[PDB]
């Protein structure tokens, strides 16, 4: 049975995310003591970053940049700093080096994005207010911030090499927890269609099937139902908080009943 | 015996087989075709 319509439902959100608090900021922390910001409970549009002018590095790990405006996440972590032109490569999984091992270890199983911008016209003086840590007795763990002398000052000066100029880089870490989605992005939600094979989008759950009125007794903190084979069986309405029952579309095999061709050309179908 | 065989066949549908997830819709909605092909290939081999 082929589906006929599509159902889209989104939560109660009208706030916009404060991306400009970091992307448009004028103060950046040292590479050895990073600044971490929590963004949630807002609509996020990544097309501006996709279409941003003068962007140098824009590489998405585990997600594609163009499909990032249609997803939902539990929360997004934005982290900011300033780095040299030559040290950009170290901020990546599976990378070693002074910064990657002694300043900030990016985990191998990381999901998210990394964006780098040249900030010579804003940070260069030599701007020694930015310090990069040089010595440890062991390499840093992922997401760790540990704060000869271990710290050395940066030579961010005008006319320096582009590989030595200050670079403003932002590490966006995307998290997918069991919690209901908080950062959703812009999409239009519709009403509910019952007793039809339709396409489902109750973020972050998607699927196809038949929707009826469910009589399951969910608990107030409870969002989903599942069957014996660990298969989805019920959903909550993002806007009305109502339980919906799911039944698959019917299917089966087609067989043809025929006498010999020598006797007739008519058949029956089961 | 027949019921146990069918139950095992059904439960083998939630394994990862070294991909990032055990759902085709998820990986189709997250990744680009060039690497989605590799991970879908892994899943296909497991199911076969």
């Amino acid at each position: 049975v082929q589906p006929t319509e599509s159902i889209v439902r989104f939560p109660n959100i009208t706030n916009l995310c404060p991306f400009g608090e970091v992307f448009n900021a004028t103060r950046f922390a040292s590479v050895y003591a990073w600044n971490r910001k929590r963004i949630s409970n807002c609509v996020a549009d990544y097309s501006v970053l996709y279409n941003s002018a003068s962007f140098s590095t824009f590489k998405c790990y585990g997600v594609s940049p163009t499909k990032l405006n249609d997803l939902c996440f539990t929360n997004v972590y934005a982290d900011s700093f300033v780095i040299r032109g030559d040290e950009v490569r170290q901020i990546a999984p599976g990378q070693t080096g002074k910064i990657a091992d002694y300043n900030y270890k990016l985990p191998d199983d990381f999901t998210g994005c990394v964006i780098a911008w040249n900030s010579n016209n804003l940070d260069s003086k030599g701007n020694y207010n930015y310090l990069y840590r040089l010595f440890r007795k062991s390499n840093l763990k992922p997401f760790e911030r540990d704060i000869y002398f271990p710290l050395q000052s940066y030579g961010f000066q005008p006319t320096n090499g582009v590989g030595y100029q200050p670079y403003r880089v932002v590490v966006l870490s995307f998290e997918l927890l069991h919690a209901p989605a908080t950062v959703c992005g812009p999409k239009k939600s519709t009403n509910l269609v019952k007793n039809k094979c339709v396409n489902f989008n109750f973020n972050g759950l998607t699927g196809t099937g038949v929707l009826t009125e469910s009589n399951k007794k969910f608990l107030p903190f409870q969002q989903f139902g599942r069957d014996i084979a660990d298969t989805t069986d019920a959903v909550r309405d993002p806007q009305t908080l109502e339980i919906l029952d799911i039944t698959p579309c019917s299917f089966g095999g087609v067989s043809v009943i025929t006498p010999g061709t020598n006797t007739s050309n008519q058949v029956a179908v089961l | 015996q027949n019921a146990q065989a069918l139950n095992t066949l059904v439960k083998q549908l939630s394994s990862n087989f070294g991909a990032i997830s055990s759902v085709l819709n998820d990986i189709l909605s997250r990744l680009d075709p060039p690497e989605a092909e590799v991970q879908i290939d892994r899943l296909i081999n497991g199911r076969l």
Binding site: G209, A229, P248, C249, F251 | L6, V10
Partner: peptide, 25 residues
Amino acid sequence: PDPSKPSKRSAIEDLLFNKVTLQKF
């Protein structure tokens, strides 16, 4: 066979048929 029952089974067959018990998408 028991003529007084809708299912033309004997008593022993009825006893036997009550001891054996008992994903589409």
